[model samples]
Target chain A: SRKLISATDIQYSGSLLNSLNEQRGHGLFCDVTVIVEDRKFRAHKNILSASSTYFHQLFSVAGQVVELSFIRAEIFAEILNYIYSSKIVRVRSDLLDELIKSGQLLGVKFIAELG
Target chain B: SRKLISATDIQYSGSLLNSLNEQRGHGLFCDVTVIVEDRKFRAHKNILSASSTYFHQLFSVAGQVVELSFIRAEIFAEILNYIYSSKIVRVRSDLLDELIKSGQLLGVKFIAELG
Candidate 1:
C-alpha cells in the first residue's frame, strides 16, 4: 500500500493569537500606554494599529501615551482584551449596547456586531 | 435611502500576522534566542512552540538560548522569516534540499513541503 503524504498542514493562527495574549498579559514589550479616564493600559502600537482603523489613525500621530475621552476604562479594557485574544469570555448583557458603540467608534467590526 | 448595516465584517488574520511579523522584526518581545553556528536569532517562545512540535519539546526544558548545531545560519534565518511572515519572497534553487532538510528537522511542515 502506497500512502501519499502532504506537508503543508501546520496551522499557526490559534497559537499566534495565544502568544500575543500571553505577551499582553505579562506586560511584555508594550510600546504604547493608553489612558482612559483614570486607568492606564499598556500595549504594542503594531497590534493596536493592525486591529483598528481608529488606532491606525491615532498611532500615526500619537506619541507613547494616548489619552481617550468619554470611553470608560473597563470597557476599553474589555475591547483591548478582545483585540489581543480575538475572543471574549463573557460580557454583561446591560453593557452590550455600550460595547457595540465602543466597537463602532474604534472600527472593530467584530465587537460592533456583538450588539 | 435606508442602508441596512451588518457589523461582523472585519477579517483579522492578515492584520494579526502583520502585527506578529512586526514584533518579530523589532525583536521587542523575544523570549528565546536560537544560535545557528555563530549567528543568533531572537524569537518568542509561544510563537515557536505553537508553530512546531520540535520547538514545543525544546522549550519544555530549554533555558532561553537554543543551539542548532547542523543547520546553516542563513537557511535558519529564512525559515524564521517564513515563521514570522508566512511568506517567502524567493528561494535559491541550490539551497532547496538543505532548506527542506532543515524544515523537516524543525517540523515546519510548510518549509518541508517546499522541497
Candidate 2:
C-alpha cells in the first residue's frame, strides 16, 4: 500500500474572511464593540488594528467601545461588512462618495479607491 | 478655505501584508518562532492565526517553538517570506511541487495556488 499525491484544501484570505463573517453573524468571541448612531457591531480588535491605522490607534488607547457620532449606523454597517468581507458586491452610485469619505476617515483604502 | 477631493492611502491586504513584512524585517514584536531544521523565523501570532489554521492551532497549544523535522530551513524561510509578504516573485519549476506541499501543510492557499 502506497500513497501517491497527498494534498488538502488550502485556506486563503477570502475563505478566512468568510469564516470571520460567520463568526460575526453568530456573535462569537468578538472583542471590540463599534457604536454608530444607535447601532452597535461586534468585531475582533486584532482584525480592526490589522486593517486600519485609525483602529490601531484607537485600540492602543485601551477602550472597548468606539463611538461614531456623525456617521450613520447603516453606512457604518456597510463599512464594517466591507472591512470584514474584503468585497463589495453592490453599492448605490449616490452613496459612493459617502462610503469613500467614511472609508478614508477610518483608513480603509479599498473603499476609498472604489469611491 | 474649501476642499475639492481629499483622500488617504488605502491599506489593502497586500499593503497590510507589506507592513507586516517590514515589521518582520525589523524584528519588532514578533511572538512566534517557527523552527525548521536549524533556522528560526519570528512572526506575530495574530497574523499567523489569521492566515493559517495550522498556525492558529499551533499557537493555540501555547508553545513558542514549532519545529518541522522534514522541511528544509531555506524552504521554510521562503514560505515565511511569502506568508509575511503575500507574494512570491518567482520559484524554480522543479521545486514547485515541494512548495505546494509545504504551503498545503501550512494552510497557505496563495502559495499553494502559485505552485
- Give the best candidate by DockQ: 1
* Interface RMSD per candidate (angstroms): 8.3, 9.2
What is the C-alpha lDDT profile of model 1 across B4-107, one tens digit per residue?
32222225655677766776776755668999998988887766875666996887678879899789999898788777766655567667789889989998
Report the interface RMSD that candidate 1 achieves against the true structure, in angstroms.
Answer: 8.3
- TM (B chain), model 1: 0.86
User: Candidate 1 chain A: minimum summed lDDT over ten consecutive residues — where?
Assistant: A1-10
- Per-model fnat list: 0.12, 0.04
Tens digits of per-residue lDDT, candidate 2, A47-113, equal: 6766767886786676767787666777778787776776654566666678778878888777756
User: Ten-residue segment with the worst summed lDDT in candidate 2 chain A?
Assistant: A1-10
The CAPRI-style docking tier of model 1 reads incorrect
Angstrom error of the Cα, residue B81, model 1: value is 4.7
Native-to-model Cα distance after best TM-score fit, residue A101 in candidate 1, in Å: 1.1
